[PDB]
């Protein structure tokens, strides 16, 4: 990406050689993944603002 | 552009900027419009 540029398009990404064709599954995961933030984790994994 | 008393006035790409020049009278040309999709989906 370019500096100070944001990417917003939530196109489904083909995570391998299996085409999504609009179907997320094997070797097809979204480019966006959610952080697993839990209070039990120590420093280095805790959420930071 | 002539108006006589169909769609024949398509919009023009902005590219990197526009230079405009006109010798017509002040009351003839009265502003401009800019955008991306020219509709609600863009400012």
């Amino acid at each position, epitope marked *: 990406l370019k500096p100070f540029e944001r990417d917003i398009s*939530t196109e489904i990404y083909q995570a391998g050689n299996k085409p999504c064709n*609009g*179907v*997320a599954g094997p070797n097809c995961y*979204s480019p966006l993944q959610s952080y697993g933030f839990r209070p039990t984790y120590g420093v280095g994994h805790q959420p930071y603002r | 552009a002539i108006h006589v008393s169909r769609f024949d006035n398509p919009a023009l790409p902005f590219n990197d900027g526009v230079y405009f020049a006109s010798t017509e009278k002040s009351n003839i040309i009265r502003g401009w419009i800019f955008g991306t999709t020219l509709d609600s989906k863009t*400012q």
Partner: nanobody
Amino acid sequence: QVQLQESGGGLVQAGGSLRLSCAASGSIFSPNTMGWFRQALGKQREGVAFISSIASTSYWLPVKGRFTITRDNTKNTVHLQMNSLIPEDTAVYYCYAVDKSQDYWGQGTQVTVSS
């Protein structure tokens, strides 16, 4: 402030049908990309489907035919159609509006199916 009115959930028998819906009101922008997220009981949240402003649809599950998205451009709301329910989809649904500046979330709807 942004409010996401969610409705349509409840208890439905297996093989039933219903209509989930949410209206996005308040300060929205123009791209307005929306969709749905499923949360199983005590499990992680996954994306159900997504609809953009150009009618482009992206389903994040092998759920085609089961789930169908309809758009209301005049009021700009999203409806999801539940048909041929199976017990495996018993999860709470929150629709998601990533939009342009700040993404938002719904409050929750309980969709339940069992036999």
